[PDB]
Write a protein that binds this ligand. Structure first.
Ligand SMILES: C=C1C[C@]23C[C@@]1(O)CC[C@H]2[C@@]12C=C[C@H](O)[C@@](C)(C(=O)O1)[C@H]2[C@@H]3C(=O)O
Lengths: 109, 95, 334, 438
């Protein structure tokens, strides 16, 4: 039916990664609420047991280079596509964020 | 009211580890009875500002949403540039 | 304390280092640390310059599965200059020429044809037996559990049997001897079975501590447990990783003489040379394999060494290595 | 002296350290019996391993934490390839015999064979005949080209990420840093390093960058343009930035006085060079002057990425033979890559490399490749001790070969504290890091 912004932020909270991106394509209101990067922030944070750096610096840097949605779609999904058992650690985060920064620099001109 | 009596019979039970599994069985019977009125049970929760019931009732909807195709998600709750844009931006889910 | 007085210090160091590294690389939930395993693995590269009368070169046999083999040949004595690219696949001159098709060990999970312990073994085989060797690089478990190795072996054999430059002038045929180490010996046996079913005529078979097992606990497993570099825990780990899902250690790939297996009566099989180590955790299974070969109506020359551990053939500092090499040379040039 | 029986197997253990090593192994065993699975997990995922060959150091680390070679690969081909190689080796010897009459026919002969030939050998024959054609007559776009080499081949990304880890590890504990890029190009290595210092524990330092580029009317300002975009990136992630461009015909035209270096204790210096030092061997005495300047800089790390081959022999048909094998492997790796304009412009980039390899001589020939054994001899005489690469760098290079390359058979190997990228068992490039010997 019809749900409010904070209502979608609650129902679309417990859907993890694939089903959220599924729900990014259904409803315009849910489209906008899925472009919200806090759900993807939580999704990406679930992949790591210990990022090794504070969340305060990580969130600003990742949103300054394109956001969490693009970080998940472009790089994390290749790294999890063959086997979803393994949990990402330091090296996976470093690799994906370096690729994201290089991609941000490519668009810079 | 019906949703008022529902929140009483939920929250005194809340007042009333191993308890959570049969609590979730009672919750299954609950959202079975709370079906239909579930979506307006969200509005009742917003009226009341509940915390545990809100998470529990959103969990059931989330458990539904899992693994349905676009029009499936449509017909469960009765809900071309943008279509192709979202399809291409989320292609990895469909790939 | 018990393994120190049975092997030399260098062999002890090598095997203990391998054991502790593999202990680090094994994870209880059935997953393998592949990146660290490849980082810790010591490897070499092919060289077309003859060193000590042997030169090698790699051949990409298959591209869809990335199947590769390394070919070891004796140096061309007639010529003086080092061989060129065209000289690599030069026809052999000789009435009889045997080619050994070798599979390496590692319990279906470790090592490669490029490893610095199997390259040395293949070079020594060429030098001593006076032949040519083809070392296969088959897929490994648990990423490629089963039957990936048994298909890589079949493809490599089909390739080896087609090389017109490996034919012999006596009868216009290729004389292939299947050889395997540890798990490779396992593969060798199975490959020979397949070679028996088709038209390929394998003439001999060499097994060095072949890898076989079973559900029951033999007396060697109970008595010898952790005494010499091997424990039943890691043996069961490797059998679980290699074997398919929902199968026990009585699967025919584990025990060839299981009731679900196949009978070796009325079946054409090559003559076998089985070398069984004495101080081995799984000695009883290897002796049972030899006995089953003898009682199946087949030919086999059992070589039971009383005080031999695993990996005695990786260093030329013991009498067992020399005896086994002499027996292999006599078995080949017969 | 090492143990001969074990050194053949790939392990460098002293003969007089044997007992000690064995004792350590015993100790290790006991600890792994006590600390058990959890501790072993710490040994796998929370540890960085260096130089596995040195058993003493590896065991010490584990104990402290718990407390001319010719490599050839034959891919499937046809006898027409042998006829092509026979024709190609016929012209190289004929042109070296001062024949210059059979060479014209032989060059024409190669052309008639190539059309019938199909596969990667047709491309290698076409590019070698053309370079053989205009050598006979000699005794008788660029920015987009290095771009197209990025999204198609994995050698540039391997060089950047693997060198960044060595620089990042050496920068820990410093408040001001300065890196000098001998191969500044378009500055694609550095955006990935800047984001790593932003998320660094303890606080990002002050990042200063200085690039050096080849002369051109536009490349003088193209280097200025590059720093314009890097300055805007360093502000989005809150990093203090500084930049200064250079124009120089050759790296031998440099000196330490004009790099504007503060004291090294105040600002840490790290020199970088990717695919640049081989272009300096054509000039006599060039490599010894540049390596005497790097020592004058006194950096903390110097990462070099080169090509693993011997294409700088004093005999022409020797250079011709090795180059034909090496560029046959490269064109074999690209055979399965899907056809695209990036792929087409990649072969032209390599075709210009082949053509400069055999047609030119003297300073005009810049493709003077060498092997790590030869390269390590030059650095060792300068005074640059090796800096070993760990398993963290190895791991990322392996996952790098899994995002963009999927079915292609590229492998990473460790050797003598270095990293190599090759096709199957055939090495192609090598990454090494060096430090001043003390
Ligand atoms: C876990 C293993 C694997 C061992 C036995 C051990 O218990 C420890 C030592 C391993 C080994 C080391 C190197 C060789 O590849 C091997 C065949 C051997 O002889 O000894 C390897 C051998 C084997 O493959 O069975």
């Amino acid at each position: 039916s019809n749900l409010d912004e904070n209502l979608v932020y609650e129902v679309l909270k417990h859907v993890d990664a694939k089903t959220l991106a599924m729900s990014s394509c259904v409803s315009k209101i849910w489209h906008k609420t899925a472009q919200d990067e806090r759900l993807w922030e939580l999704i990406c944070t679930r992949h790591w047991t210990n990022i090794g750096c504070g969340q305060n610096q990580l969130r600003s840097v990742v949103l300054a280079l394109g956001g969490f949605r693009r970080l998940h779609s472009l790089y994390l999904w290749p790294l999890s596509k063959p086997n979803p058992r393994a949990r990402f650690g330091k090296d996976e985060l470093k690799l994906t964020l370096s690729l994201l920064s290089i991609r941000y620099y490519e668009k810079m001109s | 009211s019906k949703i008022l009596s529902k929140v009483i019979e939920y929250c005194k039970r809340h007042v009333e580890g191993s308890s959570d599994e049969d609590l979730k069985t009672w919750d299954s019977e609950f959202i079975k009875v709370d079906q239909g009125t579930l979506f307006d049970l969200i509005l009742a929760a917003n009226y009341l500002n509940i915390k545990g019931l809100l998470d529990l009732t959103c969990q059931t909807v989330a458990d539904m949403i899992k693994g349905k195709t676009p029009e499936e998600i449509r017909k469960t709750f009765n809900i071309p540039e943008e279509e192709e844009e979202v399809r291409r931006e989320n292609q990895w889910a469909f790939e | 304390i018990e393994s120190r007085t049975v092997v030399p210090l260098n062999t002890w160091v090598l095997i203990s280092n391998f054991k502790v590294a593999y202990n680090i690389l094994r994870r209880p939930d059935g997953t393998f640390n592949r990146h660290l395993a490849e980082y810790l693995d010591r490897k070499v590269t092919a060289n077309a310059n003859p060193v000590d009368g042997v030169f090698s070169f790699d051949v990409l046999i298959d591209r869809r599965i990335n199947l590769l083999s390394r070919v070891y040949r004796p140096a061309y004595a007639d010529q003086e200059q080092p061989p060129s690219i065209l000289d690599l696949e030069k026809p052999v001159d000789g009435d009889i020429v045997p080619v050994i098709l070798f599979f390496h060990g590692g319990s279906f999970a470790h090592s490669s044809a490029n490893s610095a312990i199997y390259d040395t073994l293949c070079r020594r085989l060429v030098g001593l037996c006076k032949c040519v060797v083809v070392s296969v690089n088959y897929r490994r478990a648990p990423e490629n559990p089963y039957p990936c190795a048994y298909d890589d072996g079949w493809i490599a054999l089909n390739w080896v049997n087609s090389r017109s430059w490996l034919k012999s002038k006596k009868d216009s045929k290729v004389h292939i001897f299947l050889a395997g180490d540890s798990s490779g010996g396992n593969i060798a046996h199975n490959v020979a079975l397949r070679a028996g079913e088709s038209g390929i005529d394998v003439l001999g078979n060499i097994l060095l501590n072949p890898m076989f097992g079973g559900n029951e606990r033999t007396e060697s497993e109970k008595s010898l447990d952790g005494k010499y570099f091997v424990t039943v825990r890691d043996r069961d780990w490797y059998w679980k990783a290699f074997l398919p899902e929902g199968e026990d250690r009585e699967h025919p790939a584990c025990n060839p003489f299981s009731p679900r297996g196949k009978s070796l009566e009325g079946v054409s099989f090559p003559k076998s040379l089985v070398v069984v180590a004495g101080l081995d955790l799984i000695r009883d299974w290897q002796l049972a394999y030899a006995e089953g070969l003898k009682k199946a109506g087949q030919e086999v020359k059992l070589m039971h060494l009383e005080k031999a551990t695993v990996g005695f053939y990786l260093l030329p500092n013991n009498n067992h290595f020399h005896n086994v090499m002499d027996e292999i040379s006599a078995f080949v040039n017969a | 002296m090492d143990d001969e029986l074990l050194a053949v197997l790939g392990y460098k253990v002293r003969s007089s350290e044997m007992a000690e090593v064995a004792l350590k192994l015993e100790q290790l065993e006991t600890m792994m019996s006590n600390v058990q699975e959890d501790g072993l997990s710490h040994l796998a995922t929370d540890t960085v391993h260096y130089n596995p060959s040195e058993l003493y150091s590896w065991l010490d680390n584990m104990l402290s934490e718990l407390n001319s070679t010719r490599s050839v690969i034959l891919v499937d081909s046809q006898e027409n390839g042998v006829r092509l190689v026979h024709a190609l080796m016929a012209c190289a010897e004929a042109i070296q015999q001062n024949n210059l009459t059979l060479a014209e026919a032989l060059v024409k002969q190669i052309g008639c064979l190539a059309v019938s030939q199909a596969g990667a050998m047709r491309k290698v024959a076409t590019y070698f005949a053309e370079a053989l054609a205009r050598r006979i007559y000699r005794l008788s776009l660029s920015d987009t080209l290095q771009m197209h080499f990025y999204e198609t081949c994995p050698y540039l990304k391997f060089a950047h990420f693997t060198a960044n880890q060595a620089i990042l590890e050496a920068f820990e504990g410093k408040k001001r840093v300065h890196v000098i890029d001998f191969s500044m190009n378009q500055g694609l290595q550095w955006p990935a390093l800047m984001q790593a210092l932003a998320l660094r524990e303890g606080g990002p330092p002050t990042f200063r960058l200085t690039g050096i580029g080849p002369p051109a009317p536009d490349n003088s300002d193209h280097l200025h343009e590059v720093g314009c975009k890097l300055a805007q990136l360093a502000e989005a992630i809150h990093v203090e930035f500084e930049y200064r461009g250079f124009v120089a015909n050759s790296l031998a035209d440099l000196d330490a006085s004009m790099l504007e270096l503060r004291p090294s204790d105040t600002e840490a210096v790290a020199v970088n060079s990717v695919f640049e030092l081989h272009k300096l061997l054509g000039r006599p005495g060039g490599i010894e002057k540049v390596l005497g300047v790097v020592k004058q800089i006194k950096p903390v790390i110097f990462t070099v990425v080169e090509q693993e081959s011997n294409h700088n022999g004093p005999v022409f048909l020797d250079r011709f033979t090795e180059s034909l094998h090496y560029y046959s492997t490269l064109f074999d790796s690209l055979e399965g890559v899907p056809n695209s304009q990036d792929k087409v412009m990649s072969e032209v980039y390599l075709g210009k490399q082949i053509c400069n390899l055999v047609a030119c001589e003297g300073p005009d020939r810049v493709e003077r490749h060498e092997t790590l054994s030869q390269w390590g001899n030059r650095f060792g005489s300068s005074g640059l001790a090796p800096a070993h690469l760990g398993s963290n760098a190895f791991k990322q290079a392996s996952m790098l070969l899994s995002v963009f390359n999927s079915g292609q058979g590229y492998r990473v190997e460790e050797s003598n504290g270095c990293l190599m990228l090759g096709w199957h068992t055939r090495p192609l490039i090598t990454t090494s890091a060096w430090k001043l010997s003390t």
